[model samples]
Target: ARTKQTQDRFVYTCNECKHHVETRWHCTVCEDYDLCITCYNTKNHDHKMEKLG
Candidate 1:
């Protein structure tokens, strides 16, 4: 229902694919950059990404 949907409001999305991520990979060097596990591992970015679980 709408109850569970609201929880998704506070979520991290992948910058590359624009998909949702439960476990996110964020960049410290890059500003406001976040990647999903699939994109983070499969594709490497310019700045280093740190895993946030």
Candidate 2:
């Protein structure tokens, strides 16, 4: 059986709530910038965004 990886993964905090809401993955809508689900649904729905290099 396979086990879950225990390595540290980067997480993105909600800009509003400062909550650790997701791993450092691209947004479902923007597809580039990383955001927590709450931030994505609330704050980032309409703004142009970019990933930090």
Candidate 3:
């Protein structure tokens, strides 16, 4: 079931809004968890995030 297209596709869902979107903000402590830009700026402002790239 693994293909080049699938391998290149990396998706992350925002925890606060429950929306599936790509973002640069993510916590290193929490594995595979992500926050969208909106949530990252508004809700998760107190949390620490790191760029996985």
Candidate 4:
């Protein structure tokens, strides 16, 4: 048996990967820019990102 539970179902799209992600790493400078946890950890940007629930 397998079960996985999660939250943060907001339909925000990642700017780097351009995919639908629940949690978002919102850009501090750009209002239209967002990123998932993956890219937020594995990638880097010129500006900082904030954790959005």
The number of the candidate with the highest lDDT is 4
Look at candidate 1 and give me any clashing residue pairs.
none
Question: For residues 1-53, could you state the per-residue lDDT of candidate 3 as single tens digits?
Answer: 77564346667788778898655678877766677887777877455687543
How would the candidate models be sorted by lDDT, starting from the highest? 4, 1, 3, 2
Q: After superposing candidate 1, which stretches have Cα over 4 Å from the reference?
A: 1-9
1-53, model 4: which lDDT tens digit per residue?
Answer: 99998877447889999998778889899878998899988887779778887
Per-residue lDDT of candidate 1, residues 6-52 (tens digit):
33356778999998787898998988889888888789888877899
- Kindly give the stretch of ten consecutive residues in candidate 2 with the minimal lDDT sum: 23-32
After TM-score superposition, the amount by which residue 40's alpha carbon in candidate 2 deviates from its true location, in angstroms, is: 0.7
**Cα distance off (Å), candidate 1, residue 6:** 12
lDDT of 2: 0.54
Better of 1 and 3 by lDDT: 1
Candidate 3: misplaced stretches above 4 Å? 1-8, 45-47
lDDT of model number 1: 0.83
Score each candidate by Cα lDDT.
0.83, 0.54, 0.71, 0.85
